[PDB]
Amino acid sequence: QVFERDILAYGQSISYLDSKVKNGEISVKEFIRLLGKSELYRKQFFEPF
Amino acid sequence: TRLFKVTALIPSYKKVRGGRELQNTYFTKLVEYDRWFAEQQRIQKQGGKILSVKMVAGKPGLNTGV
Amino acid sequence: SVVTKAIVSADAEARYLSPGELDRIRGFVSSGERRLRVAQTLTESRERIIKQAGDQLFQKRPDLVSPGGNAYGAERTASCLRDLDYYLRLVTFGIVAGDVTPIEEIGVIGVKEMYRNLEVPLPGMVEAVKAMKSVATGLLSGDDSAEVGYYFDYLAGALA
Amino acid sequence: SVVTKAIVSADAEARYLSPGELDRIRGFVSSGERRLRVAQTLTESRERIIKQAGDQLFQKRPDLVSPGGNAYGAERTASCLRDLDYYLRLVTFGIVAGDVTPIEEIGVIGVKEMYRNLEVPLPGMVEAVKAMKSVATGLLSGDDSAEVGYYFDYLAGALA
Amino acid sequence: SVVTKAIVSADAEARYLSPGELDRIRGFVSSGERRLRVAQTLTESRERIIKQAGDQLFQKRPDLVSPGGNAYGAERTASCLRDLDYYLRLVTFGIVAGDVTPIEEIGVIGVKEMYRNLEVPLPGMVEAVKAMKSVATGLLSGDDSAEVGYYFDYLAGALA
Amino acid sequence: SVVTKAIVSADAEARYLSPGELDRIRGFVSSGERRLRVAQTLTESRERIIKQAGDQLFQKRPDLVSPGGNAYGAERTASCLRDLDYYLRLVTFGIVAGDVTPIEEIGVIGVKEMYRNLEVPLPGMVEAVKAMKSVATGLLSGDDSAEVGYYFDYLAGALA
Amino acid sequence: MQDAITSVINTYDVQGKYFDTSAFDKLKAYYATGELRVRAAGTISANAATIIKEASAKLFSNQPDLVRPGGNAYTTRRYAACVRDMDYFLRYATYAMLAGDTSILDERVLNGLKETYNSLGVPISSTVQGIQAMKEVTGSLVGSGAAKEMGVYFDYLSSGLS
Amino acid sequence: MQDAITSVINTYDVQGKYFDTSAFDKLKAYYATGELRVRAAGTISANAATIIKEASAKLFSNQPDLVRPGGNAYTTRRYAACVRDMDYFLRYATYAMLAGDTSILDERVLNGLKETYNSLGVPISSTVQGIQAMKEVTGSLVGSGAAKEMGVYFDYLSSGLS
Amino acid sequence: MQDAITSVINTYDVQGKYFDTSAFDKLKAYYATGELRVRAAGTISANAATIIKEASAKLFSNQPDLVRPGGNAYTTRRYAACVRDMDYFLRYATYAMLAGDTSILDERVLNGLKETYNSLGVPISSTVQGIQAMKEVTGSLVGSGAAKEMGVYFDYLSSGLS
Amino acid sequence: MQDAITSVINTYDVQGKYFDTSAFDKLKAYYATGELRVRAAGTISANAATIIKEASAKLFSNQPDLVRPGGNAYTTRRYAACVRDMDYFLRYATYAMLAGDTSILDERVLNGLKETYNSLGVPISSTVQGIQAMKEVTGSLVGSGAAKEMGVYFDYLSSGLS
Amino acid sequence: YVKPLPNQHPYGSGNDPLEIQFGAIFKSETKAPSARPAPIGKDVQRILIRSGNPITNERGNPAGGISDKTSLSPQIFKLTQDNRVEVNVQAVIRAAYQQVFGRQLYEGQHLSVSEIKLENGEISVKEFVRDLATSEIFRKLYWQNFYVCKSIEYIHRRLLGRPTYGRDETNRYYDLAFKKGFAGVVNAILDTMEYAEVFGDDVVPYERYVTPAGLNLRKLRAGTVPTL
């Protein structure tokens, strides 16, 4: 949803965010927010636009 | 029927201009058959007088080869 | 003809004919005997082709001969068959010429306003040339039938 | 190619292809097999053709490799042979295409500007192409030699 | 001449010659005698200019007089020198006239196709006319050599 | 200017500037010194010219300043003299530029529609321009008087 | 434009190589299909006006709103414009089929058509329906083998509009 | 267009002032360089073909891939287009040098040229290197005084593309 | 370009319906106001030059920087183009008033006008002020009812530009 | 984005070659200019508000129409949007100066901006004049060399909006 | 939604060529969408900026086409050479190539026989322009590789010297394409009364109007923007 496609095709992921969302430290909303504020999202959908 | 040779004289009626325009007013020229009807109409619109037209390149009365 | 179009195309660009133009002219004159015997076969079959084409025209389109139609009456039917003969002769001319130019300078250029002057339906014309296609291609050999049918295709498309 | 020129000619006039154009396409499609055999023959013998054509050209025009000439030196002679390789490849393209369209669009349009920029004499190009013609049609049979000679003819006339 | 160019311009935008153009024509006619001295000085030195320019050209381009070259042989070299004489005379004509229009009307309009028909390299022509510039400019004073160099450069650019 | 006109003419033909129009630019840059001196003379004595020409015009045309006249009043007479000042500045611009192009672009194109909108009589414009021409020509030397009168007559004819 | 033979020529030109076995195989494939292409082209040229007639009739029967008042095809002018567009589509699909490449469809037809229709107000869905109508009408005329070849180009036009 | 004389005329007409000492000094400065500019323009016109020859030779020596199969200048047509563009740049740089202003570059050459090249696929960096080659070749022929003037317009073109 | 009558004709054509009482009521209303429209149009046609002169004078008096050096109306050609634009606005407002519809304003006047002025550098606010100047000048000549009628079209031009 | 070092890395990666003398010269040129770039960036960051103030005052003094009723910058919101645009232009010119390349100006400022201003009705000529005013104000604060360098990127923005 | 129609081609903004000397550069719907469609009606008339005296536009001045040229107008090339040794004829030929194609052609591409006829007076400048515009080279350059309406717009700008006003002209020339082809379109453009009144048999076509975007390309470059 966030990156319009699964970026495991490139081996890109935010491992600590994934662990936090799976184990319940953060919710899916906080995971989505931290995922859209990350370096990956900034590189994909902030810089080129 | 390929090429007409046309002598025409088109006086001036909408302006008087100080450039050389004898070549535009009185002229003899070669026109194509398909262009000739439109050319004659345009000359007649401008009030020009058509003096003589001759057949030069093509031959009259050819069913094909035109 | 093919040579005429090739020469005009070469002259327009102020240059000698290209190897493609020469190749098409060579293929045209190489197949002269076949298209020539095809035209002979078409011309030796004047009346069979004309009469069967007229019959199929009138039985697929009954209203041309029906009262009020374009071909109602004997004289109008005669003129219809006369035009059929005209177009058959033009098809032979195009076949020997190797191109559809003779049909164009004779029968295609200005046909629409001609038949609009004569109040002749153009769907009737295309039906007639289709019937003549069928009748003529029936007589010819399989290889030659296609060659005839392509010129008939051009005529049918040109009418409507 | 033949198909491309026929289609662009039809499209320029807002019409379907005429029977002559379709017949020409049929002939080209039929001859494609011998076209490909000729192209394979020329492709396989590329190095012999280039070597013999270069030797024959420099024997006919010693000024090019004489001091002060455009081809003086091993490097510039190598570039000359490389241009011969380009033009042989273009000839094979023209054979498979059935027309001189690939030759024209790849190596004839603006070639005079290119060789004026490079101080390359066009007459030298002409004898080089004639030498390739001789060497290549030496390898090919008579029917193949005629068709390959047509393309080398076009290339030499374009350079001249 | 300067008068001719001013007149054709004035006729083109269709009015009498402007005061500045009258000043230009007076400056031209008042300097006619100096131009006549320049033309005579060049005429007196025909042979030295032509032969030194030809020698420089054949030093830079030995291939032109090499076997197979364009100017190989005594007669073809003589034709070379006679062409240089033609262009030197045209340069004197232009100096007298006050511009390059004689050089165009006699020596530049259609020169490329002509030397193509004669297989004469235009790079050889520009080298030769540059050599004529180098020789002729030294014969004259600075102010006059500048004017003559203008015509020689213009001819060299026209040939290229 | 002359440089701009020559560059535009050379660009419209997609060619470098010919030696004739390079000579034209050479003459223009030669005359630049005296044309700057003329323009500076006009600039320094602008108030004197404006006052003299305004008085001369108002005496020659009492109706403009009389009640019911276009220039009646302090503000409208000030506007009249301010227009005269614009045209004097334009003539200086034309002198430095070497042509009437600055005058045309800034104060000639559409002037008739402007003054028609402003109820400003054009014969008064023409007489004011002629008065300024007389005053200026009086103030500067005889040789430069013709050059200045060229621009003033251009402006007078344009306003006429 | 570009066709299959010119496509092979162009790729080998950009790569700067002489022809290999793969290129000759592609050329042989085109030569094999060429005679069928010529037959289909002649058939469509013969029956162009007919094919347009049944395809337009089928489209306006399936979507009667277009021809009725308030429909995009409701006027003599707008109806004639629709028929003209359909004639263009058929002719250029025939060109692409005979060429063996869809480049002519990209350049002459598809590069600009969506924006033109969106500015004009033409329904693109109905236009794709008209193209499909032409496809299924012409398939019965050209024959199954030629229908398979013509279907890819009609699908190309439909996908370009969609 | 707009040359230095017209530039001063415009900058003083927009303000509404007469020519003052500074304006007359600018005009004097322009008129002083007139002979140098005319001489340089004549020299470049005489040797334009040679300049394009050497500049293109150096550019394709540094970047041979441009004129090899797969390069943007690989064909006779595209090589001719390359040398035509270089000739255009040289001619317009000469015009700007004669005028003493860069306006003609912006309104006759650089207006939409960058996006034209981007749409075409033309390598802009290679074009800039070609312009630099033209500049360094021209400088030797015209002389240092004229070379300094030609340089500013060559770099104006380069910055317009870059 | 559609007037009130054409608008009713179109709204009845798109429905495919014949005319009924409501359409006759609308056309009768237009025919009732037609005499006022014709009188106002004739008055404006006879006094067009006076209106333009008065409104241009008022605008350049309220904004004197326009006709002073450095203003967009400073040259003879730019002043002429300014009064030419005022003539456009007056003439097309007369057309729209006579037709009874503002279609000609979206149709021949305001389409792409903002982009045109922005490219030319023409001031938009000053042009709106000039359009008002024409509105107050024209109202006095045409009377109260005709002024109320022409005001909608002048305000249409002003709002479209603003 | 892309900067000078990244640009050289990219142009040597596309061709697959290792760094050679020319690449090292370009890298050394950027490394030498870096200190001046950093000083300029700090100066602009410290004085960005003042630069925007002075450039906006210059623009709205020259063209009072933009802030009068009917102007594009007439409200508190539209005025604030205008000064926000100027702030963004200055900050991204600073970014491009510090990077040494104009990639960020393309991808992050100018890609889609001119169509946005055409839709919005923003006068792009006035915006370019404001950018030029920003260039003039910034040069005085940064000094001659940094003024030339930043003027490069200001002119890039101005020409890109064109 | 909240503003009037843009200054735009009736068939979209991607149907506007870049106003440069030569090249026929259009936007692509696929390389980067960047597409704006607008509800431009069939009767909408575009606003065009004169390349010359502003008050010579036909909308204000119907007789502005035949008006006297100012210094703001392009160069005008007229062939007064006797219309039965002269450099004016060669200049006219070069100007005709510069207008029809935007540039000089290559040496193999010149329409040599038409140049000979023009030099010897058998044909007028208009007929020479027709020969240039109906040539196979012109068709190869500007017709066969473009969207049909894109080609029509570009050819209209080359020949009449102005963009199309609206859907009347574009639709007429689209129908002419549909019926008669490229030659039909080109001959129709030269047969217009507008051509004859502006360009007789004597004068080479020149550029009379530009779009606001084309003016923006030239005037808004940092060198040509008016300094505050």
Ligand SMILES: CCC1=C(C)/C(=C/C2=NC(=C\c3[nH]c(/C=C4\NC(=O)[C@H](C)[C@H]4CC)c(C)c3CCC(=O)O)/C(CCC(=O)O)=C2C)NC1=O
């Ligand atoms: C530059 C070379 C050139 C010449 C020589 C020239 C002569 C010339 N005179 C013309 C008409 C005319 N010429 C005259 C002049 C004559 N009427 C008599 O009363 C007088 C005795 C005498 C004059 C002194 C008149 C009155 C006309 C009007 C035609 C008419 O209505 O009959 C026309 C045709 C009208 C037009 O311009 O379109 C030409 C071409 N034109 C040129 O471009």
Ligand SMILES: CCC1=C(C)/C(=C/C2=NC(=C\c3[nH]c(/C=C4\NC(=O)[C@H](C)[C@H]4CC)c(C)c3CCC(=O)O)/C(CCC(=O)O)=C2C)NC1=O
């Ligand atoms: C070689 C080229 C050529 C053609 C083709 C041609 C056609 C032609 N058909 C004519 C009459 C006619 N032709 C037809 C034929 C039509 N009736 C049916 O509808 C059919 C669909 C169709 C024929 C297949 C008819 C009915 C008339 C009589 C019309 C009348 O009474 O005026 C006439 C008038 C002369 C006469 O009435 O005798 C011409 C000139 N002329 C030419 O020079």
Ligand SMILES: CCC1=C(C)/C(=C/C2=NC(=C\c3[nH]c(/C=C4\NC(=O)[C@H](C)[C@H]4CC)c(C)c3CCC(=O)O)/C(CCC(=O)O)=C2C)NC1=O
């Ligand atoms: C006034 C204008 C004018 C010119 C210029 C002119 C040149 C000219 N040179 C000719 C031959 C020639 N011209 C040359 C000269 C070339 N050889 C190269 O090495 C040099 C680069 C170059 C001279 C510098 C040569 C070698 C020939 C002999 C060609 C042949 O006979 O095959 C000929 C053919 C007639 C003959 O053989 O005598 C002409 C007409 N004619 C004119 O009416």
Ligand SMILES: CCC1=C(C)/C(=C/C2=NC(=C\c3[nH]c(/C=C4\NC(=O)[C@H](C)[C@H]4CC)c(C)c3CCC(=O)O)/C(CCC(=O)O)=C2C)NC1=O
């Ligand atoms: C640089 C080119 C240029 C010109 C030429 C120009 C003329 C000009 N003169 C004006 C006023 C005026 N100009 C005049 C001059 C006339 N009075 C007499 O009739 C004389 C015949 C004649 C002068 C010799 C007058 C009387 C006015 C006042 C009009 C009024 O307020 O009603 C105005 C109205 C704006 C203003 O007053 O500031 C313009 C635009 N503007 C320009 O930008």
Ligand SMILES: CCC1=C(C)/C(=C/C2=NC(=C\c3[nH]c(/C=C4\NC(=O)[C@H](C)[C@H]4CC)c(C)c3CCC(=O)O)/C(CCC(=O)O)=C2C)NC1=O
């Ligand atoms: C408002 C302007 C307008 C008109 C006029 C118009 C004509 C029109 N005529 C049609 C069919 C038709 N029209 C006719 C009328 C013919 N029958 C005889 O032959 C006569 C010669 C002639 C009438 C005197 C017929 C029979 C059809 C049916 C054809 C068919 O079903 O294939 C259709 C197709 C209807 C559909 O697909 O549902 C239209 C749209 N369309 C318009 O938007």
Ligand SMILES: CCC1=C(C)/C(=C/C2=NC(=C\c3[nH]c(/C=C4\NC(=O)[C@H](C)[C@H]4CC)c(C)c3CCC(=O)O)/C(CCC(=O)O)=C2C)NC1=O
């Ligand atoms: C060869 C490449 C090419 C194409 C194809 C093309 C299409 C095209 N179709 C048009 C109109 C049209 N096209 C259609 C057809 C559509 N609407 C109907 O409902 C159907 C569902 C559907 C067709 C199957 C209609 C109805 C119009 C009229 C639009 C109008 O007048 O507002 C127009 C504009 C004519 C005008 O309104 O002035 C163009 C340019 N242009 C090109 O350059």
Ligand SMILES: CCC1=C(C)/C(=C/C2=NC(=C\c3[nH]c(/C=C4\NC(=O)[C@H](C)[C@H]4CC)c(C)c3CCC(=O)O)/C(CCC(=O)O)=C2C)NC1=O
């Ligand atoms: C496929 C289309 C195409 C062609 C044909 C083409 C030719 C071509 N030949 C070149 C060099 C050259 N070409 C030649 C050939 C000449 N030597 C003798 O004079 C002969 C008469 C003649 C060859 C038969 C020579 C000597 C050079 C070297 C020039 C130099 O070193 O300055 C160059 C300069 C770039 C490089 O050397 O890599 C090109 C572009 N380029 C193309 O994209």
Ligand SMILES: CCC1=C(C)/C(=C/C2=NC(=C\c3[nH]c(/C=C4\NC(=O)[C@H](C)[C@H]4CC)c(C)c3CCC(=O)O)/C(CCC(=O)O)=C2C)NC1=O
């Ligand atoms: C007068 C202002 C102006 C210019 C300069 C201009 C450039 C221009 N160059 C073009 C083609 C070209 N231009 C080049 C040159 C470039 N590619 C090479 O790699 C070099 C690095 C570089 C030159 C130094 C090439 C190779 C082409 C062919 C590309 C193609 O047409 O597909 C085209 C496409 C249209 C045509 O070829 O006729 C244009 C419009 N257009 C203008 O209106």
Ligand SMILES: CCC1=C(C)/C(=C/C2=NC(=C\c3[nH]c(/C=C4\NC(=O)[C@H](C)[C@H]4CC)c(C)c3CCC(=O)O)/C(CCC(=O)O)=C2C)NC1=O
């Ligand atoms: C009916 C639809 C329509 C309109 C509205 C229109 C406006 C228009 N005004 C123009 C010039 C102009 N328009 C103005 C007017 C402005 N300057 C002053 O500040 C005033 C505030 C304001 C007018 C009240 C000026 C000064 C110019 C000259 C700009 C220039 O030449 O650079 C131009 C470009 C020159 C031309 O070719 O005519 C157009 C197209 N054109 C149209 O087809």
